[PDB]
Structures are given as C-alpha cells and as structure tokens.
Symmetry: D2
Subunit: 255 residues, 4 copies
Amino acid sequence: SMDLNQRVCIVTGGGSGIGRATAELFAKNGAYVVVADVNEDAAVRVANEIGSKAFGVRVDVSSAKDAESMVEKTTAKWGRVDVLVNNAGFGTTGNVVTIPEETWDRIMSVNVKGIFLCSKYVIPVMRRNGGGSIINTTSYTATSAIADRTAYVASKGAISSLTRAMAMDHAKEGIRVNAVAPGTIDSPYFTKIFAEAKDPAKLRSDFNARAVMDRMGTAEEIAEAMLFLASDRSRFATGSILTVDGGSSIGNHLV
Amino acid sequence: QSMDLNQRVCIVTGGGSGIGRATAELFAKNGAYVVVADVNEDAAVRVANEIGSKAFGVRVDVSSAKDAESMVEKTTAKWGRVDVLVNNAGFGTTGNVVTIPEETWDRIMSVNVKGIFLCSKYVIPVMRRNGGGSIINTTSYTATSAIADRTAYVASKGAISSLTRAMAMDHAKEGIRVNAVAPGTIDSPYFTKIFAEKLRSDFNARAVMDRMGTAEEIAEAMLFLASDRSRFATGSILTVDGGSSIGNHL
Amino acid sequence: QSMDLNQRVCIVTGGGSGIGRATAELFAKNGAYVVVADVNEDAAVRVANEIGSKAFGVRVDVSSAKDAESMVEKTTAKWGRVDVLVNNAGFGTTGNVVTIPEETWDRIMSVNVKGIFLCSKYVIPVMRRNGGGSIINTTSYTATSAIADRTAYVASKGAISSLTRAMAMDHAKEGIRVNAVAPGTIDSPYFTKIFPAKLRSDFNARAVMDRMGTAEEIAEAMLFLASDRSRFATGSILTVDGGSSIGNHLV
Amino acid sequence: MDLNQRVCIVTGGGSGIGRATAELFAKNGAYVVVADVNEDAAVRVANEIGSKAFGVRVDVSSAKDAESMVEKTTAKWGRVDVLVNNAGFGTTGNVVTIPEETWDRIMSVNVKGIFLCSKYVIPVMRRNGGGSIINTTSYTATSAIADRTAYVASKGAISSLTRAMAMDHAKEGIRVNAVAPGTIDSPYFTKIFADPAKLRSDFNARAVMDRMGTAEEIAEAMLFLASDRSRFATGSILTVDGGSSIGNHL
C-alpha cells in the first residue's frame, strides 16, 4: 500500500517503540519521514535503516529552539509538511505527595508543551501547503486512570482536551487533529523493567491483565492507528480519540 | 487494491443502501465473501448482484429472531463460518418524548438496538467455533453530543455505545472483538430528497469541517475495525464525524 | 432539617423500595408533596402511609402508557401541578446476548428506557404549564464502565444517559431541566439474600472506596438535582459510585 | 450547617467562584482559609466573612507559598478537612499565537497549583481522618472551544488528574472530585461588554438554557462535594454548565 506516497511526515519520539514503528510504517507507505528524537543516535539509527527517504534529527520537544529548527530542516530538505505525529513523551511513578515538583514540570513540558511547540512551528508550514494531519499520543489513562502515575495521567488528559481544541482552531485551515489512545504497549520502558526483573514473565502477566484481551499491545499495532489517521482513509475524522487498548478503559473486567 | 479481508466471511446488515452498501462493496473489494442482509430483499439482491459471486443478498428484519437465525444458517451453509458482522440496520425519526408515538419509540428500539442483540445471538456461536472474529456496530456522534428533536434515535445510539463495551467484555475470551463506528451526518438519497424539495448549509454546519460525510468514508472506518489492522482494539467507539461532537464551533 | 423541596410536587417511580423509596422519604423530609409510584401497589402505599398525609401511593407499571397517564392525572387532580419527576423504576438480569432470552431483553428496555419516555410524555405537558421543573433519570456507572454478563441492563443504561442529554435539549426552552444520577453498586435486600463474606468483598471491590453505596446516598444526589441548588445544571450525569467507573484500581 | 467546624481552604478565594464558595462554606459553619494570588482580594473576602475566615496571599504555582498556607492553617486550626482548588486563569490564542511563557504560566497555575496544594494538604488530612478535595475543571475539557487552547488543555489535565488522585488517596479516606462550570458571569464580562447586547447574547448562547451561570450556583456544587451529602462520590466530575457541553443546540 502507498497511503502516504510522497507525503512529508514528522514523527517525534521516532527513535524507539511507537514512534519508530510509525516512522517505518509511514516510509513503507511511501512517505518522506523526519525521525525526531531526544536521543540523536536512536533517531539516526532508525532513519539509516529506512534509507534515503528519512533523516534523523535530535529534538527535545520541550525546547522551542529544537522544535523550530526541526521544521527548518524539514522544509529545507522537502519544502513542506503534510503530517506531524507528536509521540515524544514519558511517565514516572508517584502521587502528588511523592512526585518531585521538578519531575512534575518535566512531564508537563515534554508530554504536553511538546505538542504545542512542534505544532506552533509546523502549522505555519501546513497553512502554505494546503493543510495536513496532526496526530497526538494520549492514553487510555486519560479517561480510565491508574494509581501512582499521577503526573503522567494528568499530562494525558491535557493531550486529549488539547486535541479537540486544536481540531477546532485549525479546521478552517484544512488541518485535521486527532489523537491515538494506546493501552499498555510493549516498549523500551517495559524492556528495561523486564531486563531488570528476577521474574519478567510474571510481571508481564500483571501488565497483560490490564486489558480484557489479556496482553500488552505492540508498537506496530499502534502504528496502524497512526497510519489510519495520517492517511486519506480518515479525511472526515477530526478532534477524535482513536483508542487501541485491548479494552483497558471500557469497564473493570477483574471484578 | 488492498486485500484487508481476503477470504473473510462478512455479514453486513442494512447492506442494501447508504453506509451498509458502501461497506459491503468495500469489504468485497478487499477480498471478503459478503452476505448483504437488508429489510428490503430487492435492495439486498441488487447489491449482491453488483458485487458478483463473492456475495449473496438475503431479506432480514433484524428485529426478527427468526430472520436473524435464518440469515446465519444461510451464511454457514454457503461459506461455513462468519468472521465479521457489521450491524448497520437502523433508522430514526423526528420528535421528542411528548411527540413521538409509543409504537415508533418501540420500533426504533427493536431495530436499532435489539437487532444487534439478535444478529449477535446467532452469529457469536458460529464465531466461537471458528476462532473468533470482529463485530462492528453503528452508533452515532449524537450518543455523546446530542441533538434536539430526534430523541428516540438518540437514546437508541447511547444504548448501542454501552452495549458495544458490555459485549466486548462478554466475548473477549472467545477471541471476539466488538467495536462501533460513530458517524457524523452522512449525505444520502434521503438528504437529496429534502434538498430537491439554509437547510443544507445547516446540515454542513453540524461539523467543524463544515460538510457532511460520505457513506464511503464511514466504510473505511468499518474496514479498519473489521480487519487485522485493529487487532488490539476492542470495546471502542471510532468517531468519524467531521468534528460534530467535540465542542460547539458555532 | 433542610427544606429544599418545600411545597414542590414530586413524582417518584420505583418508589416502593431501594433508591426510589429513599428518595421519596428524603423529598418528603425536605417538604415535598410526593407521589410514590410503584409496579407493586402494596409497596407504594406502604411507603406513602409511612410518609403520611403529604404522600400518596399509586400502582404504576411505567411500561404502560395507560398507567403513566393515569398517574399524572391523579397527581394534578390532587395537587394541580408537577415540579419534579424522578424516574427510578428499573431492573436488571444476568446473561449476555447469547443467553438472554428475547423476552427478557424487551422487558428490560420497556421498563428501564420506555418508562422514562412514557412518564415524561405525560409529565412534560403539565410542567410546561407550571413554569417548568426538573426531571431526574437513573442511569448507572456501567453506562460508561461496563461489566460483563449484564448486557441488556448495561445497554438500557447507556440509552438512559443519551436520552437525558437529548431531553435536556428538547425541553430547555420550557424551563425543564433533565439530568441523571449514575449510582455505583448499592446495597439492598437482593444483596442481603444472595449473601459468604468473600462475596460481599467482591462487590465492595468494584469501588475504589471498597464498599457498596446506600439508597440514602443516592437520594442525596436526587435531591441535589431536584432542588434549586442545581438550577444551572441540565443534560448532566451526576455519578455517585465510590469510584467504580474512574479506572481500574485492581490491576 | 453541612460544614460545621470543618476547616476549608479555598484557593482563588478572592473573586468569582472561589469567593462565593468561601462565603457559602462559612454560611454552613466552616472555618475558611481564603487563599488568593492577590492578598487584598483574599483579605477583603475574609473580612466580609468575619472571624471564621482569614485571608492569605498564595501563588499556588509556588511550593513555598503552598506549604506555608498549610502551616498557617494547621497552626490556627489544627487540621484541614476540605481543600477547594479554584485558582486558575485562561488566555485567548491557539498553539501558533500563544507565547511559550503564557502556556507555561497557565499549566503552572491551573494544574501544578492542584499538585502543590494537595501535596501539602494531603499529609495533614491523612492524620485527621481523611477529607474532601474539589478541583475546578471546565465544560471545555469535554466540549472544547476554539481560541483558548492552553486554558482548554489545562482543564483536561485537571479532569484526568481528579480521577488519578481519587485512586491514589481513597485508602486514606480522601475523596477527590471536580466541578465543571459553564460560562460564569463576572466583572470581566461586565467590562468586555461595555454591540454590548449582542456580545452578551453570544456568551448566553453557549448554554442550552441560554444564560450564563453565577458564581453562587457553582458554589452550591462545591458545597455538595465538600459535605457528607456526597460521601459515596469520588473521582467524579460534577457538571453545572447550563447544558453547554451536551450537544450542539445551535
């Protein structure tokens, strides 16, 4: 399939997990891809594996200078931006009592201000190339919370509400804005947890049980939702949350 | 030509017109065998004939237990299995709780919600035996973001939305995913009829994108949820409504 | 004693037991004239007798248009107006789409959803003449956060939540607010019966607060919505569920 | 007397919703800490209430001011039973036009203020048998509007944060809920108006009830959620918005 043929797609967080699998799937679908990641070597590795239709660039999406620079390099190379996937983000454990105020602020700056900054510099370019599609990464936890990840969970509800507002702000400009809400996805964050566990498969079983489907999702499964929303298969979808979560947010199947 | 449903057996109710027709056709373009099931036998047959030997049409009133079980039996005699069920049979009416007649209220509940119940009652035993599958219901943006003066219809869509979650939890252990599509206002011969006879601008104005959707656009979301590209999605509502339900842009 | 409904005329369906009874009693303590409507005649009259002269009990099957209309006619004959309608008649059953009999599916939809439509069909023309009022439906936390093996019940509750929003939009212009309460699992004699201590514990565990709610706790939400304390609220769902629908605390 | 002798902290208590809440809590028997970024405003409200309130200057984005607020409260009255997080503000613009600093300032006051006040209040409640925390989200967390983009983003964070907190602290007997107000008449609006009549009419039209709400109306919802009348409610959003987020009635 060539759903994004010759479309220019920026994927932030593109060095690993969801962003990687999205950058690769978009390129398989004919896109030019900018692989943007806080870790420059990871971004370059993934762009190198994709080949001449990708480049990797180091971006801390919390940094306005990085974000505007990422856009300048993209337009210098391919002259336009058709799709932006805001997938940079992270989480920590703790509650309001135990989360350090610096950690709270870092989470909000990367997960939510990141969208605001990349979109701030991308959207003037889409306005000069007939519009485009922006896709944010929220979480099933935006609506069905979990305990002891409080800053992360707050950041995800910001992303869901911001997605609706942005869709309203930019509809008249031909710019669609939607978000994907993944369930618990096997990712480098989990790879490390498992690599450091005495009992990996048991821990995994615990994560599996968050979903009614009784497993974790994969990066490639989320990339498919990103592709649906980036492509013309979803041209009448804007301000929506597309959930792919194994049924983690639809009711308590453990009672 | 993608073949996202290559050799999958798909039943599409309300398959004679509008969304269900566009879904039946798209699934068949994607290599499915299609059962076009419609309240109007002629309409169902007309679409199956159009698609060719990979489809057949069957008259079904989804409010009838006897029609629904017989639909499943013809399907299995022909192709031996059911991989996908699209519940698209449905209708609405104008009025509020004061003006809607009690008979119309009941009929809207029988077709729009009980139809899912009866088709799935007979489909799921078959899916259970063939390793599971995918069931896709049709809710509406209005389930979440109401409109005035279609009150029975609106209530029925909320039922479909909640029923989709309950069913997803009921049947996940059997490898059956249940999800729903929430369309916005979709252009159709019904809307043509009124346009032929401010109104259109007002329909367009429901969506922040300021137009209506098409049957084909909702068929793409049906195809995504029927296919293996949404293998990790269950109990979800996938909204394709031009932003009609996300806030008041007016 | 708060007098949040003083002299207001209030119809409560399902008033003979559980949430509907606690609501009828709380409304009367807050000064209301109360119509205790119930599918069981004895249960409605019992409650109305215990309340005293500011209540009457009437047999009503909210699935019957005749009974619903008769109920409203009796109310306006006695007291000339209707200020509040609480739709609390309702029941559930266990099973899924495969095991639930068609007859049971239809009966759940007719009582739980059609009962709202029919009572309000006859109530609303009266409120339109008395300056509006407040209609309160009973949905469930499961309309949002489903449970397995109650599928007809769960479908009916999502119809009620959507219907509440549509109705608020249909009748705002008449000064009629329409809201619903979403209760959690509420202790009742059904639970006394089916109970041994492990199984209470599994029901308690539905809620992050690790208990079931009471009928009285739900009546306080019904009084909030029936009263003037909520005059700017319409089309809303007020959840009182101990945190049973806010995310999975058991993982 | 729903809050008789309960100690209640109200941030943003110097104006709008926070002030009406502070006054209603005191009418129901509470000791009230009126906290506000503007000292004079807090003092003004505390003076009007009398000797059951004191005014304190607090910028809720400041960890120092927030812990200091709690230490003054426990030094005066020995306990905290209720925290109302109502400090907040919004701005017009979208992601292109909102300056970065404003975006940060909105997140810091609107969302981080909840985090910091609760960080210091919760350890107290934990020792005094639990309590009730009420945040102020908005109808727009659900039903967005255009051109207020950081403010809308902040309110979705507050709603999700409310659910998270209710789960984090249920075991301590601490309930956490939020109110979602509609558009609330205020001196800001009196100014923005003085075509005046038309402008008022557009803000009124956001609600199906075709008016703006009052601060005193939202205060009644704060008082329900503070008091024992809502003891089985936690993690919830209580909407009082004249039906502004329920569907498009325009």
